[PDB]
């Protein structure tokens, strides 16, 4: 009637290392930090062990979001969805012009935050 090892999360890592003991005591709460690329959506950053013996929590980290890549002069930037971490964008030129640079960009971890895996292409004559 008690708690097994912690379930791997897509958005957070422990603060005090996991030796993955065969079990944990009912009621123990474990401290989590945000993975690179994520920020916090909730005040409290943890997960406890309830009376049944499972970890119970909220989703405390969500995606960081890149800024706009800039105004593509004489071309258009296609945001399928958003600029949220690991979202791809695609660029493209007007009929007069051709693309010099990259056609795709990914929102990626760039040291202390999220940036653009490739910079703005240019639309040349």
């Amino acid at each position: 009637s008690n708690c097994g090892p912690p379930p791997t999360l897509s958005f957070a890592a422990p603060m005090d290392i996991t030796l993955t003991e065969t079990r944990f005591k009912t009621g123990t709460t474990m401290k989590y930090t945000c993975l690179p690329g994520y920020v916090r959506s909730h005040s409290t950053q943890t997960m406890t062990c309830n009376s049944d013996g499972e970890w119970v929590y909220n989703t405390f980290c969500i995606y960081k979001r890149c800024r706009h890549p800039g105004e593509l002069r004489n071309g258009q930037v296609e945001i399928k969805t958003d600029l949220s971490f690991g979202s791809q964008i695609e660029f493209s030129c007007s009929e007069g012009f051709f693309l010099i640079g990259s056609t795709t960009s990914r929102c990626e971890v760039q040291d202390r935050g999220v940036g653009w895996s490739h910079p703005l292409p240019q639309c040349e004559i």
């Binding site: 920020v39 005040s43 960081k64 800024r67 706009h68 105004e71 958003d82």
Partner: protein, 71 residues
């Protein structure tokens, strides 16, 4: 026109990344205040439960006195 519309699109997307960032710095702070205030709650508690152990002992020590004041 083509270049002011795509400018608003930049502004909006610039704002959204920033708000979700402020949003991050903020409950970073309310995370740490809610922490102290949990610590401080326990500290002050500990203090009181002590100053109550002691008040109880001194209350027996004055009960002993009152007695010896015949014995």
């Amino acid at each position: 026109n083509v270049s002011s519309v795509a400018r608003r699109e930049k502004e909006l997307y610039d704002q959204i990344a920033d708000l979700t960032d402020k949003n991050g710095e903020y409950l970073e702070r309310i995370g740490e205040l809610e922490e102290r205030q949990k610590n401080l709650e326990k500290l002050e508690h500990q203090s009181q439960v002590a100053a109550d152990k002691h008040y109880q002992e001194q209350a027996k020590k004055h009960q002993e006195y009152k007695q010896e004041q015949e014995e």
